[model samples]
Target: PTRGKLLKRFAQIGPYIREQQCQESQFFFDCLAVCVNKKVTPEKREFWGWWMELERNGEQLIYYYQVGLFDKNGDWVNQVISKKDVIESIHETLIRFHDFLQAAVSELEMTLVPDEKMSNFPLPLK
Candidate 1:
Protein backbone atom coordinates (compact mmCIF):
# COMPACT_ATOMS: atom_id res chain seq x y z
CA PRO A 1 0.00 0.00 0.00
CA THR A 2 2.98 2.29 -0.33
CA ARG A 3 3.64 4.70 -3.20
CA GLY A 4 5.34 2.10 -5.34
CA LYS A 5 2.55 -0.46 -5.70
CA LEU A 6 -0.13 2.01 -6.69
CA LEU A 7 -0.90 0.53 -10.07
CA LYS A 8 -0.29 -3.03 -8.99
CA ARG A 9 -2.67 -2.51 -6.09
CA PHE A 10 -5.50 -0.91 -8.04
CA ALA A 11 -5.16 -3.50 -10.74
CA GLN A 12 -6.26 -5.97 -8.10
CA ILE A 13 -9.35 -4.07 -6.93
CA GLY A 14 -12.42 -6.29 -7.08
CA PRO A 15 -13.50 -9.00 -9.44
CA TYR A 16 -16.14 -6.59 -10.74
CA ILE A 17 -13.89 -3.57 -11.43
CA ARG A 18 -12.65 -4.73 -14.77
CA GLU A 19 -10.80 -2.85 -17.48
CA GLN A 20 -10.27 -3.55 -21.16
CA GLN A 21 -6.53 -2.95 -21.12
CA CYS A 22 -3.59 -2.81 -18.77
CA GLN A 23 -2.71 0.78 -19.73
CA GLU A 24 -6.18 2.04 -18.86
CA SER A 25 -6.02 0.23 -15.55
CA GLN A 26 -2.59 1.69 -14.89
CA PHE A 27 -3.85 5.21 -15.43
CA PHE A 28 -6.61 4.64 -12.92
CA PHE A 29 -4.14 3.40 -10.35
CA ASP A 30 -2.01 6.48 -10.81
CA CYS A 31 -4.96 8.77 -10.25
CA LEU A 32 -6.15 6.79 -7.24
CA ALA A 33 -2.76 6.75 -5.58
CA VAL A 34 -2.54 10.53 -5.63
CA CYS A 35 -5.37 10.75 -3.10
CA VAL A 36 -3.48 8.83 -0.48
CA ASN A 37 -0.72 9.89 1.97
CA LYS A 38 -2.31 13.15 2.99
CA LYS A 39 -2.59 14.59 6.48
CA VAL A 40 -6.28 14.71 7.28
CA THR A 41 -7.76 18.17 7.53
CA PRO A 42 -10.59 19.31 9.80
CA GLU A 43 -12.71 16.66 8.11
CA LYS A 44 -12.46 13.28 6.53
CA ARG A 45 -10.04 14.42 3.85
CA GLU A 46 -9.16 10.98 2.56
CA PHE A 47 -11.08 7.76 2.06
CA TRP A 48 -9.00 5.58 4.40
CA GLY A 49 -11.45 2.70 4.09
CA TRP A 50 -14.00 1.50 1.55
CA TRP A 51 -16.45 -1.32 0.99
CA MET A 52 -18.25 -2.34 -2.15
CA GLU A 53 -21.44 -4.15 -1.03
CA LEU A 54 -22.13 -5.50 -4.48
CA GLU A 55 -24.56 -8.36 -4.69
CA ARG A 56 -26.48 -10.07 -7.43
CA ASN A 57 -29.76 -11.70 -6.54
CA GLY A 58 -32.46 -12.41 -9.10
CA GLU A 59 -31.45 -9.44 -11.25
CA GLN A 60 -31.14 -7.13 -8.25
CA LEU A 61 -27.98 -5.28 -7.16
CA ILE A 62 -26.94 -2.95 -4.32
CA TYR A 63 -23.71 -0.93 -3.83
CA TYR A 64 -22.49 1.33 -1.05
CA TYR A 65 -19.47 2.91 0.70
CA GLN A 66 -18.79 2.57 4.40
CA VAL A 67 -18.10 6.15 5.64
CA GLY A 68 -17.47 6.86 9.29
CA LEU A 69 -15.98 9.59 11.46
CA PHE A 70 -14.83 9.84 15.06
CA ASP A 71 -17.52 12.11 16.50
CA LYS A 72 -17.28 14.74 19.24
CA ASN A 73 -18.09 12.20 21.96
CA GLY A 74 -15.47 9.70 20.76
CA ASP A 75 -18.05 7.57 18.96
CA TRP A 76 -18.27 6.63 15.34
CA VAL A 77 -21.19 8.42 13.70
CA ASN A 78 -22.31 8.71 10.13
CA GLN A 79 -22.01 12.06 8.41
CA VAL A 80 -23.47 13.04 5.07
CA ILE A 81 -21.09 14.16 2.35
CA SER A 82 -21.70 17.86 1.85
CA LYS A 83 -21.75 18.96 -1.74
CA LYS A 84 -21.09 22.50 -0.62
CA ASP A 85 -17.72 21.42 0.68
CA VAL A 86 -14.83 21.62 -1.73
CA ILE A 87 -14.77 18.59 -4.00
CA GLU A 88 -11.06 17.86 -3.39
CA SER A 89 -11.67 17.91 0.35
CA ILE A 90 -14.47 15.42 0.93
CA HIS A 91 -15.74 13.68 -2.19
CA GLU A 92 -12.63 13.75 -4.36
CA THR A 93 -11.10 10.51 -3.12
CA LEU A 94 -14.28 8.48 -3.30
CA ILE A 95 -15.54 10.06 -6.47
CA ARG A 96 -12.21 9.69 -8.22
CA PHE A 97 -11.96 6.07 -7.17
CA HIS A 98 -15.37 5.34 -8.66
CA ASP A 99 -14.73 7.45 -11.70
CA PHE A 100 -11.58 5.51 -12.48
CA LEU A 101 -13.51 2.23 -12.28
CA GLN A 102 -15.49 3.00 -15.46
CA ALA A 103 -18.77 1.96 -13.84
CA ALA A 104 -22.34 2.69 -14.84
CA VAL A 105 -24.38 4.51 -12.24
CA SER A 106 -27.59 2.53 -12.67
CA GLU A 107 -26.09 -0.85 -11.88
CA LEU A 108 -26.01 -0.07 -8.14
CA GLU A 109 -25.72 2.51 -5.36
CA MET A 110 -23.37 2.98 -2.33
CA THR A 111 -23.63 3.56 1.45
CA LEU A 112 -21.41 3.58 4.57
CA VAL A 113 -21.18 2.00 8.02
CA PRO A 114 -18.84 1.55 11.04
CA ASP A 115 -18.74 -0.50 14.27
CA GLU A 116 -22.48 -0.22 14.84
CA LYS A 117 -23.20 -2.13 11.67
CA MET A 118 -20.15 -4.03 10.39
CA SER A 119 -16.95 -3.16 12.19
CA ASN A 120 -14.72 -4.13 9.31
CA PHE A 121 -14.52 -2.43 5.91
CA PRO A 122 -12.02 -3.14 3.20
CA LEU A 123 -9.30 -0.59 3.77
CA PRO A 124 -8.65 0.41 0.18
CA LEU A 125 -5.88 2.81 1.02
CA LYS A 126 -2.11 2.84 1.21
Candidate 2:
Protein backbone atom coordinates (compact mmCIF):
# COMPACT_ATOMS: atom_id res chain seq x y z
CA PRO A 1 0.00 0.00 0.00
CA THR A 2 1.03 3.62 -0.45
CA ARG A 3 2.19 5.68 2.54
CA GLY A 4 -0.95 7.83 2.65
CA LYS A 5 -3.22 4.79 2.56
CA LEU A 6 -1.21 3.12 5.28
CA LEU A 7 -1.52 6.19 7.47
CA LYS A 8 -5.27 6.35 6.85
CA ARG A 9 -5.72 2.68 7.79
CA PHE A 10 -3.71 3.13 10.98
CA ALA A 11 -5.73 6.17 11.94
CA GLN A 12 -8.81 3.92 12.07
CA ILE A 13 -8.02 2.01 15.26
CA GLY A 14 -10.26 0.09 17.66
CA PRO A 15 -12.53 1.89 20.11
CA TYR A 16 -10.23 1.01 22.98
CA ILE A 17 -7.52 3.16 21.40
CA ARG A 18 -8.39 6.82 21.21
CA GLU A 19 -7.29 7.81 17.77
CA GLN A 20 -5.68 11.19 18.36
CA GLN A 21 -4.26 11.16 14.84
CA CYS A 22 -1.62 9.45 12.69
CA GLN A 23 1.25 11.36 11.11
CA GLU A 24 4.00 10.71 8.64
CA SER A 25 6.78 12.54 6.79
CA GLN A 26 9.81 11.77 4.67
CA PHE A 27 11.78 10.19 7.52
CA PHE A 28 9.71 10.34 10.71
CA PHE A 29 6.28 8.95 11.68
CA ASP A 30 4.26 8.69 14.86
CA CYS A 31 0.79 7.19 15.05
CA LEU A 32 0.02 9.17 18.31
CA ALA A 33 -1.35 5.71 19.05
CA VAL A 34 -2.20 5.88 22.68
CA CYS A 35 -4.42 3.15 24.21
CA VAL A 36 -5.65 4.10 27.64
CA ASN A 37 -5.87 1.64 30.52
CA LYS A 38 -9.12 2.60 32.22
CA LYS A 39 -8.70 -0.51 34.34
CA VAL A 40 -5.68 1.13 35.93
CA THR A 41 -7.03 4.60 36.46
CA PRO A 42 -10.12 6.63 35.68
CA GLU A 43 -8.11 9.70 34.69
CA LYS A 44 -6.55 7.60 31.89
CA ARG A 45 -2.97 8.84 32.15
CA GLU A 46 -1.34 5.48 31.71
CA PHE A 47 -1.21 4.14 28.17
CA TRP A 48 0.27 1.79 25.62
CA GLY A 49 1.13 3.07 22.18
CA TRP A 50 2.94 2.56 18.93
CA TRP A 51 6.04 4.20 17.47
CA MET A 52 6.62 3.55 13.83
CA GLU A 53 8.71 4.80 10.93
CA LEU A 54 9.64 4.02 7.39
CA GLU A 55 12.90 3.40 5.62
CA ARG A 56 13.68 3.46 1.97
CA ASN A 57 14.72 0.06 0.64
CA GLY A 58 15.65 0.63 -2.96
CA GLU A 59 12.30 1.57 -4.54
CA GLN A 60 10.18 0.16 -1.72
CA LEU A 61 9.38 1.74 1.61
CA ILE A 62 10.00 -0.63 4.52
CA TYR A 63 8.08 -0.18 7.75
CA TYR A 64 8.91 -0.67 11.40
CA TYR A 65 6.31 -0.86 14.13
CA GLN A 66 7.22 -0.85 17.82
CA VAL A 67 5.01 -1.26 20.86
CA GLY A 68 5.79 0.75 23.97
CA LEU A 69 4.30 1.49 27.38
CA PHE A 70 4.04 4.64 29.49
CA ASP A 71 3.35 3.67 33.06
CA LYS A 72 3.08 5.30 36.53
CA ASN A 73 6.84 5.74 36.68
CA GLY A 74 6.80 8.24 33.76
CA ASP A 75 9.08 6.02 31.77
CA TRP A 76 8.85 4.07 28.55
CA VAL A 77 9.71 0.46 27.77
CA ASN A 78 9.53 -0.36 24.11
CA GLN A 79 9.81 -3.53 22.10
CA VAL A 80 12.17 -3.27 19.16
CA ILE A 81 10.97 -4.74 15.91
CA SER A 82 13.32 -5.29 13.04
CA LYS A 83 12.46 -5.96 9.41
CA LYS A 84 12.10 -9.64 10.27
CA ASP A 85 9.58 -8.82 13.01
CA VAL A 86 7.22 -6.77 10.83
CA ILE A 87 3.59 -7.87 10.51
CA GLU A 88 1.80 -8.52 7.22
CA SER A 89 -0.79 -5.74 7.44
CA ILE A 90 -2.17 -2.89 9.52
CA HIS A 91 -5.06 -5.12 10.60
CA GLU A 92 -2.60 -7.59 12.08
CA THR A 93 -0.76 -4.73 13.76
CA LEU A 94 -3.84 -3.31 15.46
CA ILE A 95 -5.21 -6.74 16.44
CA ARG A 96 -1.90 -7.90 17.86
CA PHE A 97 -1.48 -4.66 19.81
CA HIS A 98 -5.03 -4.92 21.12
CA ASP A 99 -4.31 -8.38 22.47
CA PHE A 100 -1.17 -7.10 24.10
CA LEU A 101 -3.06 -4.16 25.62
CA GLN A 102 -5.67 -6.49 27.09
CA ALA A 103 -3.00 -8.68 28.64
CA ALA A 104 -1.21 -5.66 30.05
CA VAL A 105 -4.39 -4.25 31.54
CA SER A 106 -5.23 -7.64 33.05
CA GLU A 107 -1.83 -7.82 34.65
CA LEU A 108 -2.16 -4.31 36.01
CA GLU A 109 -5.57 -5.11 37.50
CA MET A 110 -4.33 -8.27 39.16
CA THR A 111 -1.28 -6.52 40.59
CA LEU A 112 -3.14 -3.43 41.75
CA VAL A 113 -5.98 -5.31 43.41
CA PRO A 114 -3.63 -6.59 46.05
CA ASP A 115 -3.31 -3.03 47.33
CA GLU A 116 -6.53 -1.41 46.25
CA LYS A 117 -5.86 1.74 48.19
CA MET A 118 -2.47 2.25 46.61
CA SER A 119 -4.08 2.41 43.17
CA ASN A 120 -6.23 5.28 44.35
CA PHE A 121 -3.30 7.25 45.77
CA PRO A 122 -1.77 8.02 42.38
CA LEU A 123 -4.94 9.82 41.25
CA PRO A 124 -3.34 11.50 38.25
CA LEU A 125 -1.70 14.01 40.63
CA LYS A 126 -4.83 15.93 41.44
- Which candidate should be chosen as best, given lDDT against the real structure? 2
Candidate 2 vs. true structure, TM-score: 0.31
Report the lDDT of model 2 for residue 116.
28
- What digit string (tens of lDDT, one per residue) describes model 2 on residues 10-116? 34433332234334432233332444445666454655545434443333434344555655565445632233333223235555654543354344332101122
TM-score of every candidate: 0.29, 0.31
lDDT of 1 by residue, 1-126 (tens): 222343344455444232332241122111221232357554544432223333323223333445444343433334433333432343455565665443432222322122233334333321
Q: Give the total clashing residue pairs for model 1.
A: 6
Candidate 1, which ten residues in sequence have the lowest lDDT sum? 24-33
Top TM-score model:
2
Computed on alpha carbons, the lDDT of every model, listed in order, comes to 0.36, 0.40
Angstrom error at residue 59, model 2: 1.6
